[PDB]
Design a protein around this ligand. Structure first.
Ligand SMILES: [Mg+2]
Ligand SMILES: [Mg+2]
Ligand SMILES: [Mg+2]
Ligand SMILES: [Mg+2]
Ligand SMILES: [Mg+2]
Ligand SMILES: [Mg+2]
Ligand SMILES: [Zn+2]
Lengths: 102, 74, 117, 60
RNA sequence: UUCGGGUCUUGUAAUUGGAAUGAGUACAAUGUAAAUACCUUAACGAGGAACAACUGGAGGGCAAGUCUGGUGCCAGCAGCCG
């Protein structure tokens, strides 16, 4: 079904109100919940341009933007596919308390 | 089907080799003998012809009308 | 007065022989090329004019018209473009005819008067 | 990158739009004078005859 | 014979005049128990007549843009379809 579709990138760093987070489990209705690297478990919504275009699963470091009025929830934006996640761990912008390897 | 990284340079700079705006090179070239005869300075070009002044660098006087032809010791 | 200097400048422009500026004038007059040489009185430090006088004697005749600004203004320097003089500033300050172009009326008369009397 | 800033800034396009100044626009004759203008515009100075009115057309 | 007189009219112009007048002031008088206000009226009171008309809307429903620039399934709009 690729004929119906629209048919080596680089990482993007967090910028003043967004954070890298690790998904802990995938929730229904299209939602998800992720630990932000602050000691907090936030509730992320899979944003548009993202829903059924690029997938994500458990144990995947992924960028999420916060909403300034209600910190308890947030919306996920940009995914990182398992190789620039190591780079993210390397550059040290986020604490390395969470290593994810298989 | 590709996004290009910026061409970052590990090279300081290379600028256009600007020509030197020489102010009145002809007084340097000539020498007037008190309202009469006038002499030229430092050589005349035999390979190019009369009137073309030559180049002073050292142990060699140099052309530049037909540049590669004449650079000889004197 | 000087209605033929414009004319001879234009005729030499027809044959592209104006030693414009000064360096071309010097190199041409050291050769047997320059016919008429004009150096102006309005030259600062008068060293260039002094050297021109010393050389041209040696291609001997000259005309000593002053005020080079208007000279190069109508000596064929720049472009008229619209009706007249479409340029900020322009001048020559020394001119030399290497090639005559045309003739008729005033070529060698006032040169005979000025240079050979 | 993925997004220039924080999404849902609550007034993003208003905050970032290029705010163009208003114009001078000489006074329109308002009232029955507006009916002057408009009636002369449509029904006595007939402007487009082929097909429909196409009034207020896109200049192109 | 192409014309072109615009010959007859209509419009369009930051061109250009002189008319007319109220909203506002205000002599007064009337009006009223006293008064305000109105109805009259001296004298004032229009040039950009800045003495300035807003409120919604221009995909359909439904009259009106496939104009410009901005955002880029975000912000938002949308009674419904979107
Ligand atoms: Mg295809
Ligand atoms: Mg979402
Ligand atoms: Mg008004
Ligand atoms: Mg609207
Ligand atoms: Mg409106
Ligand atoms: Mg309509
Ligand atoms: Zn030589």
């Amino acid at each position: 079904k690729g004929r119906r579709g629209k048919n080596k990138r680089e990482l993007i760093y967090k910028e003043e109100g967004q954070e890298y987070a690790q998904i802990t489990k995938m929730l229904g209705n299209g939602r998800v919940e992720a630990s932000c690297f602050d000691g907090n478990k936030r509730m992320a919504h899979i944003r548009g341009k993202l829903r059924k275009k690029v997938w994500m699963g458990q144990g995947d470091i992924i960028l999420v933007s916060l909403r300034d009025f209600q910190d308890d929830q947030c919306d996920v934006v940009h995914k990182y596919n398992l190789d620039e996640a190591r780079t993210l761990k390397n550059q040290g912008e986020l604490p390395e308390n969470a290593k994810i390897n298989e | 089907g590709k996004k290009r990284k910026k061409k970052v340079y590990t090279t300081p700079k290379k600028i256009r080799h600007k020509h030197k705006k020489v102010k009145l090179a002809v007084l340097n070239y000539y020498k007037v003998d008190d309202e009469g005869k006038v002499a030229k300075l430092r050589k005349e070009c035999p390979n190019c012809g009369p009137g073309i002044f030559l180049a002073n660098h050292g142990d060699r006087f140099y052309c530049g009308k037909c540049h590669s032809t004449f650079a000889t010791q004197k | 007065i000087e209605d033929a200097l414009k004319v001879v400048l234009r005729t030499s422009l027809v044959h592209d022989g104006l030693a414009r500026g000064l360096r071309e004038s010097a190199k041409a007059l050291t050769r047997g090329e320059g016919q008429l040489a004009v150096l102006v009185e309005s030259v600062t430090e008068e060293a260039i004019s002094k050297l021109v006088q010393g050389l041209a004697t040696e291609n001997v005749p000259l005309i000593k018209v002053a005020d080079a600004k208007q000279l190069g203004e109508w000596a064929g320097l720049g472009k008229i473009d619209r009706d007249g003089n479409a340029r900020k500033v322009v001048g020559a300050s020394v001119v030399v005819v290497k090639n005559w172009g045309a003739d008729t009326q005033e070529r060698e008369i006032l040169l005979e008067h000025f240079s050979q009397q | 990158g993925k997004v220039h800033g924080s999404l849902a800034r609550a007034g993003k396009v208003k905050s970032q739009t290029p705010k163009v100044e208003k114009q001078e626009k000489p006074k329109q004759p308002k009232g029955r004078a507006y009916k002057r203008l408009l009636y002369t515009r449509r029904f006595v100075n007939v402007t487009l005859t082929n097909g429909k009115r196409k009034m207020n057309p896109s200049p192109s």
